[PDB]
Design an enzyme around this catalytic site. Structure first.
Site, mmCIF file in Angstrom:
data_model
loop_
_atom_site.group_PDB
_atom_site.id
_atom_site.type_symbol
_atom_site.label_atom_id
_atom_site.label_comp_id
_atom_site.label_asym_id
_atom_site.label_seq_id
_atom_site.Cartn_x
_atom_site.Cartn_y
_atom_site.Cartn_z
ATOM 1 N N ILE B 134 0.829 -1.211 0.000
ATOM 2 C CA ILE B 134 0.000 0.000 0.000
ATOM 3 C C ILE B 134 0.857 1.252 0.000
ATOM 4 C CG2 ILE B 134 -1.886 1.293 1.105
ATOM 5 C CD1 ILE B 134 -2.326 -1.664 -0.043
ATOM 6 N N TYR B 135 1.826 1.314 0.905
ATOM 7 C CA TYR B 135 2.750 2.451 0.915
ATOM 8 C C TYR B 135 3.422 2.659 -0.452
ATOM 9 C CZ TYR B 135 6.189 5.833 2.613
ATOM 10 O OH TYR B 135 6.922 6.984 2.811
ATOM 11 N N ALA B 136 4.015 1.583 -0.970
ATOM 12 C CA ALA B 136 4.706 1.632 -2.262
ATOM 13 C C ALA B 136 3.720 1.964 -3.368
ATOM 14 C CB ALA B 136 5.418 0.293 -2.556
ATOM 15 N N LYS B 139 3.108 5.760 -3.127
ATOM 16 C CA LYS B 139 4.261 6.539 -3.594
ATOM 17 C C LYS B 139 4.533 6.342 -5.090
ATOM 18 C CE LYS B 139 5.428 8.492 0.298
ATOM 19 N NZ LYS B 139 4.970 9.906 0.513
#
Lengths: 214, 214, 230, 230
Positions: B134-136, B139
Site C-alpha cells: 500500500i505504501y509503495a 508513492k
C-alpha cells in the site's frame, strides 16, 4: 475457474473460456459474452470499488472456489493535473486502485493453490504522457501491488503479474514498429499466457503488450 | 520562497532556510523548527488531503507568491494486502496520493516561473517488500505524477522531481554498502540539490537517496 | 515450414528451448560451439518425437562463422523465421578482480556474439519473424561478482529494444527472456515466492510464447522468467 | 588535498566537469587521448582562476595506459579521491549497418575503457571517495542507430550498481550521470519541457553534487540530467 472483472475484458473472458475456464464475467453485454462462451462450448454484477465479497462467495457457491482472477475493471478519463476535479480523481483511484486492491484483498484469502492473478495496467505508466498523470498514477499503484502481492503470497503457489497493453486514424496503427493496431485479442493472448501453463514460472512481472512502442 | 509540507521534513525546511528560502513550514514542533530557522538567521497548519488553497493564498499573502514546494507530508502504516482495512487503505491514499496531487494541483496554477517541485517517495517502490504494498503503491502513483507533471508544466520553466530516501539496531546501518545509517540531513541535501542551482537541469526524475541499497 | 536457429542450444535452457520449438513445429537448428555430442543428443530426441532438427557448430563471436550458420540454414530449409540467442558464459569476478581475458571473453561471447546474430538476422530474417535474446535477472539483481556478466546482458537488452524499433516495417518482433537461476538447496529452491526451483522448461515456456501466436503483439520487451524474485 | 581524475576531459562536458571540480577545490587531472592543446587550455583556465590542474594523456581502453594515469596522479599529489569517466565515442549506426570495427570501437572506449578505470579505482581510490560514470539518456530513449552506444552505456550503468555494492566497507560511492543532448534548433532547444538547450555546466552540476557533500548518501544511482525528456 476464473473471475474476470471489467472489448479487452470480453476478449479475455472468451479466451479463458476457450482455454477451458469457467469464466465468472463481471460488470457494474455481459450476457452476450456469456452466451457466445456457451454457444462456443464453454461455460455477476458488482462494483469492484463489500460487493467484492459477495462476488467471490457467488462463485465458490456455484463452482466451489476460485483459481484465477483478472482485474480488467478500470476507467480512464484524461485530465491534466491542473484541471482535475476531486471527483475525476477519487473515482479514477477508487475504480482502478481500490477496486484492484479490493479484489486482491479477497483473492489474497480465497484463491486455490496453483493460482494466477493478472492485473491490468497500461504502457502509459512508462510513457507518462500529459494528462495520463492520474490514470498512470493509478495503474502505477497497481503495478507496485502486483510486485508486493507476489512475495506476500509466498508458499501458496500463486503468481501475481500485470499486463500493460497500449492503445487497442491510421497513424495510431503506424505508431508501433509493427505498423498495425493492437487487437483485444492480442492482450487476451498475453493474459492467456500468464494464466496458462507456459506462464507458470512468470511471477511478479509487468508484461507490456504494445507491439513495441515501449 | 518555499512551501514545505510534512525529522526529514524538519531537516528540509531548515536546509532551505540555510540556503536562503523563506520556508512556509506546514503541519496538520512546527514553531520549534521555525524558531531555530529564525534563531539561525533565517525567516501554517493544513491537512494536505480546500485547506490546500488557503495554504497557498496564506503565503502569496505574506511573501507574494511561491517558488518552491516539497511534498514531504505522508504517512506509512505497514500492512500486508490480505490484512488491510478500507480505513488503513484510503487514508494512506488520501495523505500520500491525494495530498500530493492536491498541492500539485495548486502548485500547477500558482508557482512562479523558475520554480522547483520535489515530491517524497521511497526506495520501497523499488524494493517492494512485503507489507510495503500500500505504501509503495501510493508513492508509485506520486512518482508517475512527478513524471507527467514535469511535461505538463512545459514552458513555465518549472521542474518536477521526486526523492526516495531509504530508512533514515545496527544491522540497519550495515544495510547500505556505505555501512552507516541515513540521516535526515542526507535527504535534505538531495532535496537541497534539486531546489538549488545545481539542480536546474534535473527534471522529471526520481532521485533515490539510500546509500546504495538499490 | 518455419525454421528457428537456437544459439547455444546443446544443454539445459537452450536444449529445452530447442526441444520445445521443435515440438511447436519449428525445424530447429541446434547451434553449439564445442563437441557435438550433446547437440546430437538433442537432435536425436527431437527426431524420435516426430520433429525436424539439424545441428550446426559455430562460435558466435565469429562474424564469419555466424554468417555460415545462417547460410547453412537457408541452404537446407529455405530461410530463417526465428532466432534465439542462448549462447553465453558466466564466470564470476568482482570488477576489481576481473582480468582482461575474462572481461574480453564475457563481452565477446555475450555481447558481440549476440550482436553478430542480431546484425545477420536484421538482414535475413523472414517477415513475421521472432527474435528472442536471452538475458539474466542479474540485470536487476546486480549482485557482487556479476558486474561484467550483467553489463554484457544489459547491453543485450538495450540492443533488444533498439532493434525492435529499427525493424519497423517488417513485422519482426524482438524480445528477451531474462531467466533467474535454473537447474542450502531448500534455501535456493525456496528463493522464489513459488518456493520451487525453476526449470529449463519454464524458460522454454516464455520463449515458446514469444515465438508463438500468443506473442505476436509483444515486442521491445524484457520478460523475466525468474519465479517472482525480481 | 582532494584529487580527482576526469577522463575524457578536454572539451564540452568533460571540460566543464573539470573546471567545476577545480572550482570546488579538487586538484584535477585532465585526461585526454589525442592532441594536448585543448586540455592545456582547460588546465590554464583552471590555473588563472586559482585552481590546481595537471593534464595527462592516456587512451582508456589501454589497461597499462590507465595504470600509468593513476600512478602519475598518486606520484604527483599523493592519491586519488574522485574518478569521473567522461571518455567515450558515439558513432551512430543501426545494428544492421554496424561494422566490426565500429562495434569493437564503441565497446572498447565506452565499456572496456570505463571498466579499466573502474578496476583501478577499486584498488586505489581513497576512502570517502566518489566515482561518477557518464552514461546517456539513450539507455532509456533507445532510438534507432543508438543501439551499440546504448548497449555499452547500459553496461556501464550495470557496472555502476554492482561496483557500489562491491565497494562495501570503504565509504566509496558509485553513481552515473546520464546526460541528455547538450551543446530545428528551436525544436531541439524546445525538446525538453524547460524548453531550453541544456549545457556542459548543467551536467557539471549534477557531477559536482555527486562528488560534493550534498551527495554523500547517493550511491548505486543513475542520475539523468536531461531536462525532463525521460
Amino acid at each position: 475457474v476464473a473471475i474476470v472483472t471489467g472489448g479487452i475484458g470480453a476478449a479475455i473472458a472468451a479466451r479463458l473460456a476457450s482455454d477451458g475456464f469457467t469464466v465468472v464475467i463481471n460488470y457494474a453485454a455481459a450476457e452476450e459474452v456469456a452466451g457466445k462462451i456457451e454457444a462456443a462450448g464453454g461455460k455477476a454484477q458488482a462494483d469492484v470499488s463489500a460487493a467484492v465479497r459477495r462476488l467471490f462467495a457467488t462463485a465458490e457457491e456455484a463452482f466451489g472456489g476460485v483459481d484465477v482472477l483478472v482485474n480488467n475493471a478500470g476507467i480512464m478519463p484524461l485530465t491534466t493535473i491542473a484541471e482535475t476535479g476531486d471527483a475525476v480523481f477519487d473515482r479514477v483511484i477508487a475504480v482502478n486502485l481500490k477496486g484492484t486492491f479490493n479484489t486482491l484483498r479477497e483473492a489474497a484469502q480465497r484463491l486455490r493453490v496453483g493460482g494466477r492473478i493478472i492485473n491490468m495496467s497500461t504502457s502509459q505508466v512508462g510513457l507518462l504522457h500529459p494528462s495520463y498523470g492520474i490514470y498512470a498514477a493509478a495503474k502505477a499503484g497497481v503495478e507496485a501491488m502486483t510486485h508486493v502481492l507476489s512475495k506476500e503470497l509466498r508458499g501458496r503457489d500463486i503468481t501475481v503479474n500485470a499486463v500493460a497493453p497500449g492503445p487497442t486514424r491510421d497513424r495510431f496503427a503506424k505508431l508501433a514498429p509493427l505498423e498495425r493496431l493492437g487487437t483485444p485479442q492480442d492482450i487476451a493472448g498475453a493474459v492467456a499466457f500468464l494464466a496458462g501453463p507456459d506462464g507458470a514460472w512468470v511471477n511478479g512481472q509487468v508484461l507490456r503488450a504494445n507491439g513495441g512502442i515501449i
